[model samples]
Target: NNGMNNNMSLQDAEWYWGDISREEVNEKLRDTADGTFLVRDASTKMHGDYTLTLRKGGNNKLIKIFHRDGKYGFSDPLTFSSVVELINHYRNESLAQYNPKLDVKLLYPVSKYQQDQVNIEAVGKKLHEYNTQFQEKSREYDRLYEEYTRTSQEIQMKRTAIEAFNETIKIFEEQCQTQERYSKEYIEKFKREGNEKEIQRIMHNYDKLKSRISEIIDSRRRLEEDLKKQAAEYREIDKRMNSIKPDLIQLRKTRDQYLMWLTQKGVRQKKLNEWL
Candidate 1:
């Protein structure tokens, strides 16, 4: 007892009307007014199922109408003026073409975070090595400095001893001069008193004083030579110590730069990880 359903669902109908505006339907009808009518399904279900057509070569006055169920319906007179407005509305809603979706990707090979970690480790190791070397070199320098100081002091002491020996030589020279003056005076006194023994003893004492003065002078010369040799050795040590100072300064600067690089690397590494 299903009700008689003469009204068709436009959803699957071959001949569709309103999916396009009334104006579009009317314009299509006018263009084919001299040709036989045919009907086909509309892709969407928003329109009615009936299509209109005309006879092939008649006054075209015998308008043809196609129905969804394979039958002809009566065609009304064409209304060209009424379709113009409706066509404008349909044109506004139509799209010229469709565009597809797109996919995108981004890739990075390296980041700051990893670099920072590597730098920090490298700096720490380098500084440790530098400090160790600095300590060792400093100890050696100190040892050399002390040795030079001791050697210089010994030279001073020896010079003072040599000066003492020169003083003894001066005393002997004075004694010899006094003996010669007395020997001449005693000979003159002996001619008046006739005493020869006193004159001879004074002459012998003058000869001994002269010999002692010459020996003291020779001793002083030897001490001066020894002092000169020691001074030259001290100067060589001083030059070596001066040269080491520039090397130490350079080493410290290198160590400091390495540490700074390490710190910068650590910060960059952390930032890189955050970005990831």
Candidate 2:
């Protein structure tokens, strides 16, 4: 098949152990740690396909590699130009999407030839840094979202209270106007009849109503002022949250890059030492 030309590249990877049975693969990787994996040629039934075997939970898990239209992949619609590209893609991503039971990543490759151990400490340090940054952003967003919700609830409650207070004040104002009219009519009627006591009683009742209404109005005004202050604070927080949204996405992208690097073949000690 023309696809053989593309398959030739897989030989470059030491992990690509040529034609082997499942029994041989299990014997080699059974004792190894999880994520330790190798590639092998599929049996004659598959006729030129490949298989990826990995050690997971003390068992060797097998994944069939498909080749079609000169592209390779674990399944349709996710094909890559080469198997190496597929390995690289899945190295950073979880394979659970392909098989629900296998929620693992290809982290450690089982090489046939002798090779140096990967520098876990150096790569891990970078991974931790990026993880912390990403987690911090998520926490920040969560905290702000909670605060925003509380502030919105407070605004809603205060607005309702102010509306109720306004209704009471309007009723009081209408009653006070009627009281004023009655006091004036009593004064005119009693002054001519020499009924001073009646006029004094009416005037006293009118003054008490005016004082009570003024106190109610003053209290309502203070509450209204408080509402305005809360509204301003809410708006400021809303604006800030919008600004953090894009920054959170960017931080996650950077974090994923470091995670992918951590899964590479091996980090040279020379390079790791220089980086540190």
Report clash pairs, candidate 1: 14-40, 15-49, 19-47, 112-268, 113-268, 113-269, 116-265, 116-266
Kindly report which residue stretches of model 2 are placed more than 4 angstroms away from their true locations once superposed: 1-119, 181-186, 264-276
Best by lDDT: 2
* Candidate 1: segments with Cα more than 4 A from true spot: 1-121, 188-200, 259-276
In order of listing, the candidates' clash counts read 8, 0
Cα displacement (Å) at residue 262, model 2? 2.7
Candidate 2 clashing pairs, residues 3+ apart or interchain = none
Candidate-wise lDDT, in order:
0.51, 0.79
Query: In terms of TM-score, how similar is model 2 to the real structure?
Result: 0.52
Per-residue lDDT over 1-276 for candidate 2, one digit per residue giving the tens place of the 0 to 100 score: 245344546777767878777787886786888789888988665754889997788888778888988788888775688788788777778788777788888888877665333257766787677777778989999999999999999999999999999899899889988876765644578777787998788778778888988999899999999999999999999998999999898878666655545545565546444443
Q: What is the C-alpha RMSD of each candidate to the true structure, in Å?
A: 37.8, 13.5
